Amino acid sequence: KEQIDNLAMRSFDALKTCSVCITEYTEGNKLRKLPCSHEYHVHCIDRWLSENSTCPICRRAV
């Protein structure tokens, strides 16, 4: 879980759409960017990486 904490987490600008929940980013959301340049919701990528270790898009390991 601390591996999840040691990740590029930043504040919210751009809207786009998180590929997991398919939802537009809004204020209050905190984004998390992976080394593979892919950015997601903190909530979504945290619930994903809790049981897997791959990026949801390009499947590069983290």
Partner 1 sequence: MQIFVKTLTGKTITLEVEPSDTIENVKAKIQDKEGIPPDQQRLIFAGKQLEDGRTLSDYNIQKESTLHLVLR
Partner 2 sequence: ALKRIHKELNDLARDPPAQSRAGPVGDDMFHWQATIMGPNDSPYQGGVFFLTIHFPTDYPFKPPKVAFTTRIYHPNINSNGSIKLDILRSQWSPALTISKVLLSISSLLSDPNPDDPLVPEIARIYKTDREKYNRIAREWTQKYAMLE
In order of 3, 11, 20, 41, the CA distances from 28 in angstroms are 23, 8, 18, 11
In terms of CB distance, is 42 or 56 closer to partner 1? 56
Indicate the burial class of 45 (C-beta count within 10 angstroms; 0-12, 13-18, 19 or more).
buried
In the range 22-41, which residues lie near Zn ion by CB under 5 A? 36, 38, 41
Taking residues 31 to 50 in sequence order and writing x for each that binds partner 1 by CB under 8 A, - otherwise, the string is --------------------
Residues that bind Zn ion (CB under 5 A): 18, 20-21, 36, 38, 41, 44, 55, 57-58, 60
